[PDB]
Design an enzyme around this catalytic site. Structure first.
Site, PDB file in Angstrom:
ATOM      1  N   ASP B  17      27.867   8.479 -36.209  1.00 44.73           N
ATOM      2  CA  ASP B  17      28.233   8.805 -37.601  1.00 44.73           C
ATOM      3  C   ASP B  17      27.838   7.871 -38.277  1.00 44.73           C
ATOM      4  OD1 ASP B  17      29.483   9.787 -39.398  1.00 44.73           O
ATOM      5  OD2 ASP B  17      31.894   9.591 -38.427  1.00 44.73           O
ATOM      6  N   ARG B  20      29.860   7.086 -41.390  1.00 46.48           N
ATOM      7  CA  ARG B  20      30.362   5.490 -41.132  1.00 46.48           C
ATOM      8  C   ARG B  20      29.793   4.524 -41.446  1.00 46.48           C
ATOM      9  NH1 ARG B  20      30.433   2.578 -36.552  1.00 46.48           N
ATOM     10  NH2 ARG B  20      33.059   2.371 -35.815  1.00 46.48           N
ATOM     11  N   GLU B  95      46.106 -10.745 -31.212  1.00 43.83           N
ATOM     12  CA  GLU B  95      47.468 -10.986 -31.305  1.00 43.83           C
ATOM     13  C   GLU B  95      47.389 -11.511 -30.409  1.00 43.83           C
ATOM     14  OE1 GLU B  95      47.762  -6.394 -32.576  1.00 43.83           O
ATOM     15  OE2 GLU B  95      46.389  -7.240 -31.105  1.00 43.83           O
ATOM     16  N   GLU B 110      36.598  -1.986 -38.287  1.00 39.92           N
ATOM     17  CA  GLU B 110      36.534  -0.036 -38.374  1.00 39.92           C
ATOM     18  C   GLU B 110      38.375   0.349 -37.159  1.00 39.92           C
ATOM     19  OE1 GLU B 110      37.303   2.944 -37.509  1.00 39.92           O
ATOM     20  OE2 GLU B 110      35.683   3.300 -36.515  1.00 39.92           O
ATOM     21  N   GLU B 119      46.657   6.391 -33.609  1.00 40.03           N
ATOM     22  CA  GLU B 119      46.021   5.882 -32.539  1.00 40.03           C
ATOM     23  C   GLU B 119      45.012   4.453 -33.384  1.00 40.03           C
ATOM     24  N   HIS B 260      32.843  11.661 -37.477  1.00 38.66           N
ATOM     25  CA  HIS B 260      34.021  11.815 -36.032  1.00 38.66           C
ATOM     26  C   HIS B 260      35.355  11.911 -36.259  1.00 38.66           C
ATOM     27  CE1 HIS B 260      34.503   7.190 -36.627  1.00 38.66           C
ATOM     28  NE2 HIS B 260      35.662   7.689 -35.162  1.00 38.66           N
TER      29      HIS B 260
HETATM   30  N1  HIY Z   1      44.462  -5.430 -31.228  1.00 44.39           N
HETATM   31  C1  HIY Z   1      43.230  -5.279 -30.836  1.00 44.39           C
HETATM   32  N2  HIY Z   1      42.928  -6.467 -30.433  1.00 44.39           N
HETATM   33  C2  HIY Z   1      41.440  -6.810 -30.083  1.00 44.39           C
HETATM   34  N3  HIY Z   1      40.847  -5.706 -29.823  1.00 44.39           N
HETATM   35  C3  HIY Z   1      41.241  -4.228 -30.353  1.00 44.39           C
HETATM   36  C4  HIY Z   1      42.490  -4.572 -31.038  1.00 44.39           C
HETATM   37  N4  HIY Z   1      43.036  -2.732 -31.341  1.00 44.39           N
HETATM   38  C5  HIY Z   1      42.162  -2.546 -31.310  1.00 44.39           C
HETATM   39  N5  HIY Z   1      40.382  -3.128 -30.264  1.00 44.39           N
HETATM   40  C6  HIY Z   1      39.230  -2.537 -30.263  1.00 44.39           C
HETATM   41  O1  HIY Z   1      39.569  -1.653 -31.753  1.00 44.39           O
HETATM   42  C7  HIY Z   1      38.159  -1.088 -31.160  1.00 44.39           C
HETATM   43  C8  HIY Z   1      38.035  -0.471 -32.102  1.00 44.39           C
HETATM   44  S1  HIY Z   1      37.213   1.380 -32.267  1.00 44.39           S
HETATM   45  C9  HIY Z   1      35.679   0.245 -32.785  1.00 44.39           C
HETATM   46  C10 HIY Z   1      34.551  -0.344 -32.297  1.00 44.39           C
HETATM   47  N6  HIY Z   1      33.409  -1.339 -33.970  1.00 44.39           N
HETATM   48  C11 HIY Z   1      33.250  -0.635 -33.790  1.00 44.39           C
HETATM   49  O2  HIY Z   1      32.138   0.164 -33.873  1.00 44.39           O
HETATM   50  N7  HIY Z   1      32.676  -1.414 -35.167  1.00 44.39           N
HETATM   51  C12 HIY Z   1      31.178  -0.949 -36.486  1.00 44.39           C
HETATM   52  C13 HIY Z   1      30.446  -0.730 -35.601  1.00 44.39           C
HETATM   53  C14 HIY Z   1      29.216  -0.287 -37.074  1.00 44.39           C
HETATM   54  C15 HIY Z   1      29.514  -0.027 -38.048  1.00 44.39           C
HETATM   55  C16 HIY Z   1      31.288  -0.153 -38.304  1.00 44.39           C
HETATM   56  C17 HIY Z   1      31.823  -0.853 -37.769  1.00 44.39           C
HETATM   57  C18 HIY Z   1      37.818  -0.244 -29.918  1.00 44.39           C
HETATM   58  O3  HIY Z   1      36.557  -0.998 -29.598  1.00 44.39           O
HETATM   59  C19 HIY Z   1      39.082  -1.580 -29.234  1.00 44.39           C
HETATM   60  O4  HIY Z   1      39.128  -1.533 -27.675  1.00 44.39           O
END
Ligand code: HIY
Ligand code: HIY
Lengths: 311, 311
Positions: B17, B20, B95, B110, B119, B260
């Site tokens: 994306d 993004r 947490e 993000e 979600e 996305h």
């Molecule tokens: N409480 C929580 N504690 C710890 N981890 C948690 C918790 N809730 C959700 N998660 C994780 O959060 C991610 C969201 S998806 C973003 C992946 N990161 C990126 O692409 N970043 C990025 C890349 C390029 C540009 C900008 C940003 C998942 O891997 C979850 O496993």
């Protein structure tokens, strides 16, 4: 599991697959002698449309069985079409439910998964056949084949694999090892096919057993274009044959109208050059995963390397 | 849950994306004063690319935290780019995990889901802010908005709803009641928009609390085309503002390059005629589902009828 099939979304997709749904409709409506005054079992009846086709073709009784919550929607749908006197719906697994009859004349189902056998219920259909089909009874669809074809698509390959080498100036190469072993379900451009197809599996549902569904096949791909081979694609053909005056076939291959099954694509870790007229030799084996037996693995040997793939 | 985010597939989609990922890249690379010699916390760091952006912009230390198995891939990726002396990766929930520091200068993440809040982990990001952000510290992206726009698409409406009235000659109308309450995530043709957009929600992550994320808004849609209104669409805008010399914004709305997130579409049970220049008045409320609090419900009142929608 059956949870996914509780939701309307997958049923809408299957019903809007015209190749799939018009094939079953055509088979039943064009061969009503198979159904007239017969006792029919619909294994995994979903929304009940296949049961209603069989009733329309003059079935004496249709038993629609589904483990999923969708059966409650089937119940209302059968009542809305005033077919409750001909169609009895039973919630539960065909493996455990009690049927108001000892035997049936005909079994119909749509059990087919990606690459025919993924998360397929052929095992459940074969249970119903061995327990409930009368002597001289019939199961449909009766004949299935699986085929492989060679693919040349360096751009698609680079999009999925080489992508991870340089992502906004950072190396992410260690991701390639998670990507290669996952099969991709996608519609192929038929222009990217570089071999004749090779049949690797023939099933007759009348004679096959669960043990036949784990298989190995040697194969030979007749190369039709001098190119870089980047992937092997799989697809399947479905036949309604036994006792038909009007035989019905549909293909899920890339030379045919797309279906919701699309094609299954096994990306090669190392693409390799082939020449038109070459006889490309390989071996494929399909196993039921030890962990989730609704999960397949496919072991492919080609060009002196072996890779195992899952969906 | 975190299980879905253990697989590369969702990470590949987010990284490809460009709107993004280039927005975050541009924000960091064009405002390096925000990061130089700072302690940065990346909440849900995934594959670690955002942490590596912050390191490249001169962060003293970056702490990348993720609950998912993807963190093990992040660990190899940070080592492959020789950034292990600047980036420390910690597996677990933000947490519960123990950080080698009491406070951080900057939080980046993000967290955004469909319709911004589905979600979404904003709740987890706000926990990290309240516990770990230094006095005078900054969180990015800092400003988010949600908007609604009216849609006229009788054909798409008929494809999803009226479809079930006659399916191969059988009535399946009782299916409509399962379909109407599910929001659809899809890219809208901007030609089908029949109102000016209306902002229904403004969030500043510096001042917002979890309780602000369940909200009601009265809205007015300025109708731009005499048409049949068949749906309301939702989308969101993301702003990097605080202390930026080079501000960054991206929209997920249908007049902008697709992301996305696409758009979130709430189909109307009863489409209704609108006239150009009409001020169409409604009410929307967002609640966290009692069952799965990662599930939203959206209650929409328009044209003297109310429907609750989930994703
Ligand atoms: N409480 C929580 N504690 C710890 N981890 C948690 C918790 N809730 C959700 N998660 C994780 O959060 C991610 C969201 S998806 C973003 C992946 N990161 C990126 O692409 N970043 C990025 C890349 C390029 C540009 C900008 C940003 C998942 O891997 C979850 O496993
Ligand atoms: N052991 C089992 N016992 C009982 N039910 C089981 C078992 N394993 C799987 N299931 C169910 O089988 C369905 C497969 S999806 C087909 C829905 N049926 C159709 O669309 N039919 C149709 C419509 C139009 C044309 C042709 C066919 C799901 O609903 C599962 O819940």
């Amino acid at each position: 599991y059956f949870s996914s099939y509780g939701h309307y979304g997958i049923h809408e997709e299957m019903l809007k697959d015209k190749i799939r749904t018009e094939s079953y409709r055509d088979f039943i409506y064009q061969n009503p002698h198979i159904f007239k005054d017969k006792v029919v079992l619909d294994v995994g009846c979903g929304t009940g449309i296949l049961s209603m086709f069989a009733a329309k073709a003059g079935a004496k009784k249709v038993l629609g069985v589904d483990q999923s919550e969708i059966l409650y929607q089937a119940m209302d749908i059968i009542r809305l079409n005033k077919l409750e006197d001909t169609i009895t719906l039973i919630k539960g697994k065909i493996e455990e439910v009690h049927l108001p009859v000892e035997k049936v004349d005909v079994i119909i189902s749509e059990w087919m998964g990606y690459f025919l056998l993924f998360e397929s219920m052929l095992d459940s259909v074969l249970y119903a056949k061995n327990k409930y089909l009368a002597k001289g009874g019939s199961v449909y669809p009766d004949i299935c084949t699986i085929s492989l074809v060679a693919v040349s698509d360096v751009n698609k390959h680079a999009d999925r694999i080489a992508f991870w080498d340089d992502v906004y100036g950072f190396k992410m190469s260690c991701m390639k090892k998670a990507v290669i072993p996952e099969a991709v379900v996608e519609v192929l451009d038929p222009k990217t096919l570089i071999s004749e197809p090779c049949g690797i599996k023939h099933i007759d549902c009348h004679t096959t057993s669960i043990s036949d569904l784990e298989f190995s096949s040697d194969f030979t791909l007749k190369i039709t274009r001098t190119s870089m081979c980047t992937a092997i694609a799989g697809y399947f053909d479905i036949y309604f044959e036994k006792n038909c005056h009007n035989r019905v076939v549909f293909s899920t291959g890339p030379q045919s109208t797309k279906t919701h099954w699309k094609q299954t694509v096994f990306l090669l870790e190392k693409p390799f050059s082939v020449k038109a007229g070459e006889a490309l030799k390989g071996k494929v084996t399909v196993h039921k995963n030890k962990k989730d037996p609704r999960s397949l693995t496919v072991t492919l040997t080609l060009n002196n390397s072996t890779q195992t793939y899952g969906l």
